[PDB]
């Protein structure tokens, strides 16, 4: 008896399933060719995780495990992957990588930490600046292992390690941030499995919308943007809930709770995404207290009205 | 009236509510001399939120606004506030400190990133590690201001700037971490207002139970152990739901959903917080799968099973 | 420790061309990383590019990225900067710096080491 419905969570109050940060807009893309395959924020209405995605904002493009060797590349030391909950990963489980990897080309920066334990100095701790590029040849999450660029290759051991990212960059000029393409979990010459579906309008007049973050860089003038198609909370409020969805499109309405208003309607279609009518690439002009609500479900014919 | 509920969510499901990392463990502490006071983490069962506490994961003991002047001293760059939400953050509102502020002694590493706005190269970005003491006399969190170390004092500008965190540490020998020692929100020779109240056993036998991180430190040996009354989704989940409360304790059980037998019995109290029957430290021997489950609502003379 | 020095700087006129010279003397390894920096009057130092020493791979920034080239010379232990369609806005003191750490090569930070600076004065 759990029906379906959105959290009551204004854009400030929600949080990019891609990229451990707040929504700071809402924007509907021009259709491009562009293939929108993103694996972090993936669910079912119903409450089905998919790709890379898990429940925790922490989790999004963190990493867990053991630094194990290094080697004399740029990519220097080899970080064995855990699950981040702590439990052995699988790499025969039925995943594109661990749940939290990265989505996307680019190198992430963070900080790397240690907590040793066993016979070397078990509980000494350490910290500092480290980047993940996942373009290395050695980012190969699905298989069990990244590799880590630090600052300081002298305070570092062979030790449980965390990674944390705190924001991303372009790579270099031949490697440049592109948050729709995926990385090749499995290195370089393997394709991936396993992946969420792509997505994409299937409705004339119809743009994807865009739960929109600029997250912090590092240097240079990039904007930072990382889109989701729904955010972490929706993806924690559904997995709760886990209501059977009635059609494949649920009919949503952007409400200014204080006026109780309709601002725009918009789909939201069964595997997770939102599709409004409009042409054009527009950050979406609306009250900063609004939020969308469950309206109701419709079918394939169903004609938005113009946003 | 609306049925009172817990989140379905194990530990490693559950997002520590006072520093943005997983809990690791459920842990009942020994009664003393400690008065548990913490800011963030806090919200009543019927979803009032207090304190210091927001919604966001990312925002617990995060810093965003903008870096104004810098000083000739350790806590050398001043960060005036905003809330994290971007508004204006006023001085003179009923809360102890912008929401997200640390309520803790102690230092805070993690990173400062900033993106240019207005006439001198808007766009340009930076980042690099930063610490923020909550010992420090610049410490004014409630006045409006912070004041950050950094690694790099060249490469920062008078810009939009945010503050990441990644772990905690004691800050010196003279200033060690202490997670119940309150900072001073206004700076020192001050006294705190608009606290959330104490929290304590009640009740013979009874002790406070504790959702249980060991958070990232940054050298020497501290475990960096932060324990919330209540998991960051709990309090997401009560705001959401505003269930009346019907008595001033719901008794929950602990559950293996795996078997369907209850594990233990607590009692989760109106202002937010869990108590437990049980003498002495103890770190809880539980299974990975367990849940607590709202059972029902229960008078002042409830005894508790031995836990 | 590496040493620096910057050359080539001047007052040149809007639409012309400069190419900086950086020459490096010291210890420089695979994770050696050079960039070119600026700093106008009363402004915060700009990153403009970097380029790994040992391979020459490179990152511009958008601001730049058009008519400045960052290189290495194919013999000397010496680094340009190639500066197209000079317009004011360059005018500033032009900085080199290298860093041991790899890092990435859009990332600003972590430059320890840093010529004198040679100063571009673009007029219309």
């Known amino acids: 008896s759990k029906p379906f419905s959105l959290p009551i969570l204004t854009l400030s109050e929600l949080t990019n399933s891609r990229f451990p940060v707040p929504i700071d807009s809402l924007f509907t893309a021009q259709n491009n060719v562009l293939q929108v395959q993103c694996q972090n924020g993936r669910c079912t209405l119903d409450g089905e995780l998919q790709g890379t995605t898990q429940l925790l904002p922490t989790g999004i493009c963190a990493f867990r495990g053991r630094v194990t060797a290094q080697i004399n590349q740029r990519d220097r030391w080899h970080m064995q992957l855990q699950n981040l909950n702590g439990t052995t990963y699988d790499p025969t489980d039925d995943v594109p990588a661990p749940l939290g990897t990265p989505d996307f080309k680019g190198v992430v920066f963070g900080m790397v930490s240690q907590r040793n334990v066993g016979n070397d100095a078990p509980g000494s701790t350490r910290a500092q600046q480290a980047w993940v590029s996942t373009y290395s040849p050695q980012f190969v999450p699905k298989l069990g292992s990244v590799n880590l660029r630090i600052s300081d290759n002298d305070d570092f051991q062979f030790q449980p390690t965390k990674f944390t990212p705190v924001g991303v960059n372009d790579d270099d000029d031949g490697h440049p941030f592109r948050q729709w393409e995926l990385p090749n979990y499995s290195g370089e010459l393997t394709l991936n499995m396993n992946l969420a579906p792509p997505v994409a309008p299937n409705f004339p007049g119809e743009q994807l919308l865009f739960f929109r973050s600029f997250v912090p860089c590092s240097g240079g003038y990039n904007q930072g943007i990382i889109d989701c198609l729904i955010p972490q909370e929706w993806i924690q409020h559904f997995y709760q809930e886990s209501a059977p969805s009635q059609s494949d499109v649920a009919l949503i309405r952007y409400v200014n709770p204080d006026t109780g208003r309709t601002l725009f309607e918009a789909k939201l279609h069964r595997s997770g995404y939102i599709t409004v009518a409009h042409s054009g690439d527009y950050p979406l002009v609306v009250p900063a207290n609004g939020h969308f609500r469950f309206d109701s479900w419709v079918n394939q014919f169903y004609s938005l009205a113009p946003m | 009236s609306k049925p009172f509920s817990l989140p379905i969510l194990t530990l490693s499901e559950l997002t520590n509510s006072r520093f943005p990392v997983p809990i690791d463990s459920l842990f009942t502490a020994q009664n003393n001399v400690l008065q548990v006071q913490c800011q963030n983490g806090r919200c009543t069962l019927d979803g009032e939120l207090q304190g210091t506490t927001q919604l966001l994961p990312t925002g617990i003991c995060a810093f965003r606004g903008r870096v104004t002047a810098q000083i000739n001293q350790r806590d050398r760059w001043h960060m005036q506030l905003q809330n994290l939400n971007g508004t204006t953050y006023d001085p003179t509102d009923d809360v102890p400190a912008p929401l997200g502020t640390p309520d803790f002694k102690g230092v805070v590493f993690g990173m400062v990133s900033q993106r240019n706005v207005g006439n001198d190269a808007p766009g340009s970005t930076r980042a690099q590690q930063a610490w923020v003491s909550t010992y420090s006399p610049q410490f004014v969190p409630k006045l409006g201001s912070v004041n950050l170390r950094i690694s790099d004092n060249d490469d920062f500008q008078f810009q939009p700037t945010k503050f990441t965190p990644v772990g905690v540490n004691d800050d010196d020998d003279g200033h060690p971490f202490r997670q119940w020692e309150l900072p001073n929100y206004s700076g020192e020779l001050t006294l705190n207002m608009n606290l959330a109240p104490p929290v304590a056993p009640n009740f013979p036998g009874e002790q406070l139970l504790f959702f249980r991180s060991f958070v990232p430190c940054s050298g020497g040996y501290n475990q960096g152990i932060i324990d919330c009354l209540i998991p960051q989704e709990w309090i997401q989940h009560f705001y959401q739901e505003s269930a009346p409360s019907q008595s001033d304790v719901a008794l929950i059980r602990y559950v293996n959903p795996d078997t369907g037998r209850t594990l233990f019995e607590a009692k989760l109290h109106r202002s937010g917080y869990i108590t437990v029957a049980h003498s002495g430290d103890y770190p809880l021997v539980v299974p990975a799968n367990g849940h607590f489950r709202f059972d029902s609502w229960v008078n002042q003379f409830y005894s508790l099973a031995p836990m | 420790q590496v040493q620096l020095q910057e050359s080539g700087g001047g007052l040149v006129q809007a639409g012309g061309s400069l190419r900086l010279s950086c020459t490096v003397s010291?210890?420089?390894?695979?994770?050696?990383?050079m960039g070119w920096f600026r700093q106008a009057a009363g402004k915060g130092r700009e990153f403009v590019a970097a380029?790994?020493?040992?391979?020459?791979?490179?990152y511009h920034t958008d601001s730049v990225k058009g008519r400045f080239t960052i290189s290495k010379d194919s013999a000397k232990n010496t680094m340009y900067l190639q500066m197209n369609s000079l317009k004011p806005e360059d005018t500033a003191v032009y900085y080199c710096?290298?860093?041991?750490?790899?890092?990435?090569?859009?990332?600003?930070?972590?430059?320890?080491?840093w010529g004198q600076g040679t100063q571009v004065t673009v007029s219309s």
């Open positions: 710096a290298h860093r041991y750490i790899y890092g990435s090569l859009s990332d600003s930070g972590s430059y320890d080491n």
């Open positions: 380029m790994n020493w040992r391979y020459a791979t490179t």
């Open positions: 010291g210890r420089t390894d695979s994770e050696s990383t």
